[PDB]
Design a binder for this molecule. Structure first.
Ligand SMILES: Cc1nn(CCO)c2c1C(=O)CCC2
Length: 109
């Protein structure tokens, strides 16, 4: 299936991202109790557990929807955290990895 080809490609990419050594900050939703005013600043929170659910739920009917969510994970983090924080470092490392995988899968060419 053309839908099911997409699904496989996205699942492979998301799995690789989740397995990456720098994915650990992004594995679950930011906790309100740990991040003061995070949910006042960041309007569209996202994390890799929520993306896994969305994927299983057949939400990612296009590459664009998938890339927007995953990009939001990094840019939320970079907006909120200090530039030399461990979280910011992880976000940019993982983002580099993400762009290399989407290129390699021909999701952008
Ligand atoms: C703020 C903030 N605090 N925590 C830890 C609590 O969830 C995290 C953040 C992020 O911005 C992304 C990584 C995880």
């Amino acid at each position: 299936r053309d839908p099911d080809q997409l699904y496989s490609t996205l699942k492979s990419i998301l799995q690789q991202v989740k397995s990456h050594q720098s994915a650990w900050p992004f594995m679950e939703p930011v906790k309100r109790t740990e991040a003061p005013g995070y949910y006042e600043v960041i309007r569209f929170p996202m994390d890799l557990k929520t993306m896994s659910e969305r994927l299983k739920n057949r939400y990612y009917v296009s590459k664009k929807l998938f890339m927007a969510d995953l990009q939001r994970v990094f840019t939320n983090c970079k907006e909120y955290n200090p530039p030399e924080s461990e979280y910011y470092k992880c976000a940019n490392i993982l983002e580099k990895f993400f762009f290399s995988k989407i290129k390699e899968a021909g999701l952008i060419d």
